[PDB]
Amino acid sequence: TPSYLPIEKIDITAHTAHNIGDSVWMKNGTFVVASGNQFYIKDKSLDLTDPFTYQSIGSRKILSNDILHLSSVLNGPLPVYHPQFLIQAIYANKLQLVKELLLRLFLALRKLDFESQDVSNLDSNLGMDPLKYFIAKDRDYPVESFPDPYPCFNKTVSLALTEQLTKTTLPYLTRHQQITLITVIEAVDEVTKNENIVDYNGVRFLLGVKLFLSHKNIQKSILMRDVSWALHSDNKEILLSSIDRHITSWNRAREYRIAYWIKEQDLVKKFEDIAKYEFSKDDKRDPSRCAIFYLALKKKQILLSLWKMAIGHPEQQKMVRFISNDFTVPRWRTAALKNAFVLLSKHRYMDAAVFFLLTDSLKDCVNVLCKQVHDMDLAIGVCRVYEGDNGPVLGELLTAQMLPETIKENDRWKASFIYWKLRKQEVAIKALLTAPIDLENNSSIVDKEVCVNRSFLVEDPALLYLYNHLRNRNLKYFIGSLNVEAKIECTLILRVTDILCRMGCNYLAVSLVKNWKFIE
């Protein structure tokens, strides 16, 4: 969205051809305009026929029709039920608080309906005590109870809320924001079920994917934020089993970026299943598609059998006669390399990667997968299943193909992931705070002026919440240097606030500054 949005076009020209003489705001938004000896004082109300006012107000509902009130709706603290506040209170370790706010929202809506009062009377803070937002830790939250008919947030309250939110239009919320609020209710319902199993980097990932499902129109794969939430979770098995139902095809194992974070011991099984599916696609049986998954696993024999049973395919006779050889033989190794480089010139990139993997030249299979096929997701998967979980070919691939673009794009999620897969944990944790161009002589990769800068560098509060997690688990790497680390923690805390404040979550900014623990 633009940082500024027009809300009125005071068109004095519609009455006189004389140019505006002078313009001056005054008390309560009164905008006095002068021309000749003749003033055009406009009050702070709004004319809904204007295209600017109509577009800025959008679908919202506002108590007063004012430029002052409108400018206090498009900006300023969020109502505590706003979806952008609830997801940000979930990313911060305040899930219990979000559950309580949803319960209070239900109670307030029932109160309004029972008294037949208009919903616009709904309290923005839902009668919450502000100190609740400042509680340092999720398990220290005083989760009080309510009267018997609905004592604590649960499935019944969830369904009642999802009904009410369709039977009423919450104030200040564009209908799309209300849809995302309903999806947040569903996500909290899911988390409450899994809340007893997955640590809280599992809860953040679960909400990330549940929000992804509602935005497949504009979002083509879970952000690297969610991949990094899951990558550092201790319960990757639970997350994978929760999103498994959606991973039927490779195109859906590439949306959830499973190759990045799922455990190698599950990535092997997922390649087996994805090979099964990719073979028996909608069209017909074709061992060409599932070749890479079966070779990466080192199951050339299954691929050979697959080619054999594919009697109808035109390529069958050549491939059965070729693949059956033993590619430890130098002559056949060179023959397979030659065929791989021929297929790279006949524009058959996937087959070139397959052949480059027959001979165990992984460094050439993964470079054909990430550079000519454009699947870094599949390259990482093949690296992780074929050779091992972390490096050595994966390290070179990431440092060559991903690190430069990450530095140019100034992306710190990718940089942290890369320095994690290189098992450079001590600097992988630091890459979350300091920009990639300043890490490990990365300035040698690209000139500092080529990198993105200016307003495009919008912070990401979650990026800090991850650090405070890793920083606390990997203290061994931070005891050696405290003053230098604090010098940048105290900068990124004040730069993460001032976006938590610019995105309306002031209550979370105060919590972040209040509760941050400096490692003395």
């Binding site: 480089f341 790279l344 010139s345 050439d364 054909v368 550079k371 060559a400």
Partner: protein, 157 residues
């Protein structure tokens, strides 16, 4: 050795003996003038050659040198705006070198001018990248009409 001997000569056809270990369509230098010819048939140690020059004066017993290569064409900058002698040798350079109005028998002249400096500019490939046959790894300015002569990797490289 690589030297067979002329056994028979008839018109453009030279049958050479001691040519065991000779490949089909292999170029050969026939005679002392080193006339270029191609082995068209092989029969034991006898290889039949089609000579691409005038065979007048070829003697029985004259050496026939294997070249190990087929009749090849040089492909690269300096190929447009040129006229060639059936085989890939250039007529203008032939005239400039022999300084005569005829085409000397067995004259050897590189097909493409090897003294012209061509303004190479590399393409989209870098070190560590994989290149296969046909990949345009650069271009040179050949002339105002052909302003970018693509430099392709050989088809079998």
């Amino acid at each position: 050795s690589e030297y067979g001997a002329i056994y028979s000569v008839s018109g453009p056809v030279v049958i050479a003996e001691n040519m065991i270990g000779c490949a089909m369509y292999e170029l050969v230098k026939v005679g002392h003038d080193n006339l270029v010819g191609e082995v068209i048939r092989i029969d034991g140690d006898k290889a039949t050659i089609q000579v691409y020059e005038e065979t007048a004066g070829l003697t029985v017993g004259d050496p026939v040198l294997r070249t190990g290569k087929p009749l090849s064409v040089e492909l690269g900058p300096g190929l447009m705006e040129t006229i060639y002698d059936g085989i890939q040798r250039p007529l203008k350079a032939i005239k400039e070198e022999s300084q005569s109005i005829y085409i000397p028998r067995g004259i050897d002249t590189p097909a493409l001018d090897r003294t012209i400096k061509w303004q190479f500019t590399p393409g989209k490939f870098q070190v560590g990248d994989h290149i296969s046959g046909g990949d345009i790894y650069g271009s040179v300015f050949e002339n105002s009409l052909i302003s970018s002569h693509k430099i392709l990797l050989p088809p079998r490289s």
